[PDB]
Design a protein around this ligand. Structure first.
Ligand SMILES: O=C(O)CNC(=O)c1nc(Cl)c2ccccc2c1O
Ligand SMILES: [Mn+2]
Length: 221
Protein backbone atom coordinates (compact mmCIF):
# COMPACT_ATOMS: atom_id res chain seq x y z
CA UNK A 1 0.00 0.00 0.00
CA UNK A 2 1.34 3.45 -0.87
CA UNK A 3 2.47 5.12 2.33
CA UNK A 4 0.07 7.87 1.33
CA UNK A 5 -3.23 5.95 1.16
CA UNK A 6 -2.38 4.30 4.45
CA UNK A 7 -1.51 7.62 6.07
CA UNK A 8 -4.46 9.63 4.80
CA UNK A 9 -7.37 7.17 4.91
CA UNK A 10 -6.37 5.26 8.06
CA UNK A 11 -3.50 6.45 10.22
CA UNK A 12 -4.45 10.15 10.42
CA UNK A 13 -8.16 9.57 11.24
CA UNK A 14 -7.40 6.75 13.67
CA UNK A 15 -4.74 8.72 15.54
CA UNK A 16 -6.89 11.83 15.78
CA UNK A 17 -9.87 9.81 17.06
CA UNK A 18 -8.26 7.18 19.33
CA UNK A 19 -4.61 8.19 19.78
CA UNK A 20 -3.67 4.61 18.89
CA UNK A 21 -3.39 3.02 15.45
CA UNK A 22 -2.54 -0.56 14.44
CA UNK A 23 -1.41 -1.43 10.87
CA UNK A 24 -1.13 -5.09 10.01
CA UNK A 25 1.03 -6.53 7.22
CA UNK A 26 3.08 -3.36 6.91
CA UNK A 27 6.06 -4.64 4.84
CA UNK A 28 4.96 -8.14 3.81
CA UNK A 29 6.35 -11.55 4.66
CA UNK A 30 9.63 -11.48 2.72
CA UNK A 31 10.86 -8.16 4.07
CA UNK A 32 9.48 -8.84 7.58
CA UNK A 33 11.44 -12.08 7.71
CA UNK A 34 14.65 -10.35 6.62
CA UNK A 35 14.22 -7.85 9.45
CA UNK A 36 13.53 -10.74 11.82
CA UNK A 37 16.69 -12.44 10.61
CA UNK A 38 18.71 -9.26 11.13
CA UNK A 39 17.40 -8.80 14.66
CA UNK A 40 17.99 -12.46 15.58
CA UNK A 41 21.54 -12.15 14.26
CA UNK A 42 22.18 -9.10 16.47
CA UNK A 43 20.92 -11.17 19.38
CA UNK A 44 22.86 -14.30 18.59
CA UNK A 45 26.12 -12.38 18.12
CA UNK A 46 25.78 -10.62 21.47
CA UNK A 47 24.85 -7.07 20.40
CA UNK A 48 22.06 -6.65 22.96
CA UNK A 49 22.50 -5.62 26.59
CA UNK A 50 22.07 -8.22 29.31
CA UNK A 51 18.61 -6.92 30.23
CA UNK A 52 16.88 -4.54 32.63
CA UNK A 53 17.75 -5.30 36.19
CA UNK A 54 14.39 -6.39 37.60
CA UNK A 55 15.33 -7.77 40.98
CA UNK A 56 18.70 -7.38 42.66
CA UNK A 57 19.68 -10.02 45.20
CA UNK A 58 22.58 -10.13 47.67
CA UNK A 59 23.86 -12.98 45.50
CA UNK A 60 24.35 -11.43 42.06
CA UNK A 61 23.95 -14.85 40.41
CA UNK A 62 20.28 -14.75 41.42
CA UNK A 63 19.71 -11.34 39.75
CA UNK A 64 16.72 -11.30 37.39
CA UNK A 65 17.02 -9.32 34.18
CA UNK A 66 14.29 -8.46 31.70
CA UNK A 67 14.11 -6.59 28.40
CA UNK A 68 17.38 -6.41 26.46
CA UNK A 69 18.06 -3.56 24.03
CA UNK A 70 20.30 -2.32 21.31
CA UNK A 71 20.30 1.03 19.52
CA UNK A 72 20.40 0.86 15.72
CA UNK A 73 21.02 3.67 13.23
CA UNK A 74 20.02 1.53 10.27
CA UNK A 75 23.33 2.01 8.41
CA UNK A 76 25.32 -0.70 10.21
CA UNK A 77 26.48 -3.83 8.36
CA UNK A 78 23.67 -6.39 8.58
CA UNK A 79 21.13 -3.75 9.64
CA UNK A 80 20.16 -2.48 6.20
CA UNK A 81 16.68 -3.93 6.26
CA UNK A 82 16.10 -2.37 9.69
CA UNK A 83 17.19 0.82 7.96
CA UNK A 84 14.62 0.15 5.23
CA UNK A 85 11.97 -0.22 7.94
CA UNK A 86 13.04 3.07 9.49
CA UNK A 87 12.90 4.84 6.11
CA UNK A 88 9.42 3.36 5.61
CA UNK A 89 8.25 4.65 8.97
CA UNK A 90 9.69 8.08 8.05
CA UNK A 91 7.73 8.05 4.74
CA UNK A 92 4.42 7.45 6.53
CA UNK A 93 5.06 10.18 9.05
CA UNK A 94 6.08 12.57 6.26
CA UNK A 95 2.76 11.97 4.53
CA UNK A 96 0.95 12.53 7.87
CA UNK A 97 2.71 15.73 8.81
CA UNK A 98 0.53 18.65 9.76
CA UNK A 99 -2.36 16.22 10.17
CA UNK A 100 -1.40 14.40 13.41
CA UNK A 101 -3.00 16.59 16.05
CA UNK A 102 -1.39 20.03 15.84
CA UNK A 103 2.09 18.53 15.91
CA UNK A 104 4.80 19.32 13.37
CA UNK A 105 7.22 16.42 13.32
CA UNK A 106 10.80 17.34 12.36
CA UNK A 107 12.97 14.51 13.62
CA UNK A 108 13.21 11.09 15.23
CA UNK A 109 15.42 8.93 17.38
CA UNK A 110 17.54 6.02 16.30
CA UNK A 111 15.76 2.67 16.51
CA UNK A 112 15.56 0.88 19.84
CA UNK A 113 15.41 -2.84 19.25
CA UNK A 114 14.04 -4.66 22.31
CA UNK A 115 14.10 -8.36 23.18
CA UNK A 116 12.00 -9.70 26.05
CA UNK A 117 13.88 -12.94 26.69
CA UNK A 118 10.81 -15.01 27.56
CA UNK A 119 11.55 -15.50 31.28
CA UNK A 120 8.26 -14.08 32.55
CA UNK A 121 9.45 -10.50 32.61
CA UNK A 122 7.49 -7.62 31.11
CA UNK A 123 7.54 -3.83 31.45
CA UNK A 124 5.82 -1.85 34.19
CA UNK A 125 3.02 0.62 33.51
CA UNK A 126 4.53 3.91 32.32
CA UNK A 127 4.04 7.07 30.29
CA UNK A 128 6.55 7.50 27.48
CA UNK A 129 7.14 11.23 27.77
CA UNK A 130 5.59 12.65 30.93
CA UNK A 131 7.80 15.73 31.23
CA UNK A 132 7.90 17.26 27.75
CA UNK A 133 11.10 15.90 26.22
CA UNK A 134 9.90 16.49 22.65
CA UNK A 135 8.56 13.05 21.70
CA UNK A 136 4.99 13.16 20.43
CA UNK A 137 4.52 9.81 18.60
CA UNK A 138 5.76 6.32 19.42
CA UNK A 139 6.16 3.89 16.49
CA UNK A 140 6.65 0.16 17.17
CA UNK A 141 7.19 -2.65 14.64
CA UNK A 142 6.75 -6.26 15.77
CA UNK A 143 8.59 -9.29 14.48
CA UNK A 144 7.06 -12.35 16.15
CA UNK A 145 5.69 -14.96 13.77
CA UNK A 146 2.69 -16.96 14.92
CA UNK A 147 2.67 -15.25 18.30
CA UNK A 148 -0.14 -16.57 20.49
CA UNK A 149 -0.61 -14.44 23.60
CA UNK A 150 -2.79 -17.07 25.26
CA UNK A 151 0.36 -19.21 25.53
CA UNK A 152 3.22 -16.67 25.32
CA UNK A 153 1.82 -13.58 27.04
CA UNK A 154 3.65 -10.39 26.07
CA UNK A 155 0.59 -8.28 25.24
CA UNK A 156 1.01 -4.52 25.10
CA UNK A 157 -1.80 -3.09 27.19
CA UNK A 158 -2.60 0.61 26.79
CA UNK A 159 -4.81 2.46 29.27
CA UNK A 160 -6.17 5.41 27.25
CA UNK A 161 -6.95 8.46 29.35
CA UNK A 162 -10.58 9.13 30.26
CA UNK A 163 -11.80 5.70 29.17
CA UNK A 164 -12.72 2.80 31.39
CA UNK A 165 -11.24 0.19 29.05
CA UNK A 166 -8.00 -1.40 27.84
CA UNK A 167 -6.46 -1.55 24.39
CA UNK A 168 -4.64 -4.89 24.12
CA UNK A 169 -2.11 -5.20 21.29
CA UNK A 170 -0.54 -8.57 20.45
CA UNK A 171 3.08 -8.22 19.27
CA UNK A 172 2.33 -9.85 15.91
CA UNK A 173 4.72 -10.34 12.99
CA UNK A 174 4.75 -7.39 10.56
CA UNK A 175 2.45 -5.25 12.71
CA UNK A 176 3.14 -1.52 12.98
CA UNK A 177 1.75 0.48 15.91
CA UNK A 178 1.49 4.23 16.46
CA UNK A 179 0.38 5.97 19.62
CA UNK A 180 0.72 9.34 21.31
CA UNK A 181 3.76 9.41 23.59
CA UNK A 182 2.30 11.69 26.22
CA UNK A 183 0.13 11.08 29.30
CA UNK A 184 -2.85 10.13 27.14
CA UNK A 185 -1.38 6.61 26.75
CA UNK A 186 0.00 4.97 29.89
CA UNK A 187 0.94 1.43 28.92
CA UNK A 188 2.68 -1.77 29.98
CA UNK A 189 4.05 -4.99 28.57
CA UNK A 190 2.49 -8.02 30.21
CA UNK A 191 4.86 -10.85 31.15
CA UNK A 192 6.36 -12.57 28.10
CA UNK A 193 7.01 -16.32 28.21
CA UNK A 194 8.64 -16.58 24.81
CA UNK A 195 11.31 -14.47 23.12
CA UNK A 196 9.59 -11.29 21.98
CA UNK A 197 11.16 -8.74 19.60
CA UNK A 198 10.08 -5.20 18.74
CA UNK A 199 11.63 -2.15 17.07
CA UNK A 200 10.72 1.35 18.32
CA UNK A 201 11.30 4.80 16.92
CA UNK A 202 10.09 8.01 18.54
CA UNK A 203 9.17 11.13 16.55
CA UNK A 204 9.75 14.66 17.81
CA UNK A 205 7.39 17.64 17.69
CA UNK A 206 9.34 20.68 16.54
CA UNK A 207 7.98 23.09 19.14
CA UNK A 208 8.19 20.77 22.14
CA UNK A 209 11.72 19.70 21.19
CA UNK A 210 12.92 23.26 20.68
CA UNK A 211 11.82 24.34 24.18
CA UNK A 212 12.94 21.10 25.81
CA UNK A 213 16.43 22.36 24.94
CA UNK A 214 16.02 25.06 27.59
CA UNK A 215 15.89 22.33 30.28
CA UNK A 216 19.23 20.85 29.22
CA UNK A 217 21.24 23.88 28.16
CA UNK A 218 27.20 25.99 25.45
CA UNK A 219 29.52 28.51 23.80
CA UNK A 220 32.71 29.72 25.49
CA UNK A 221 32.97 33.36 26.54
O1 LIG B 1 7.19 -3.64 23.31
C1 LIG B 1 6.06 -3.13 23.49
O2 LIG B 1 5.05 -3.60 22.91
C2 LIG B 1 5.91 -1.94 24.42
N1 LIG B 1 7.19 -1.49 24.86
C3 LIG B 1 7.29 -0.35 25.69
O3 LIG B 1 6.29 0.26 26.02
C4 LIG B 1 8.65 0.13 26.16
N2 LIG B 1 8.79 1.37 26.60
C5 LIG B 1 9.96 1.83 27.03
CL1 LIG B 1 10.07 3.47 27.60
C6 LIG B 1 11.10 1.02 27.02
C7 LIG B 1 12.33 1.51 27.47
C8 LIG B 1 13.46 0.70 27.46
C9 LIG B 1 13.37 -0.62 27.00
C10 LIG B 1 12.15 -1.12 26.56
C11 LIG B 1 11.01 -0.29 26.57
C12 LIG B 1 9.73 -0.74 26.12
O4 LIG B 1 9.56 -2.05 25.65
MN1 LIG C 1 6.77 2.40 26.35
Amino acid sequence: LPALKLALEYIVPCMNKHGICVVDDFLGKETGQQIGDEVRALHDTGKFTDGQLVSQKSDSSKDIRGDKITWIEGKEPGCETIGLLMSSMDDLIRHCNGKLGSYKINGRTKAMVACYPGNGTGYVRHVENPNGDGRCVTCIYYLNKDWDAKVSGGILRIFPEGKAQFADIEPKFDRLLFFWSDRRNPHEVQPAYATRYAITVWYFDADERARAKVKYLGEKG
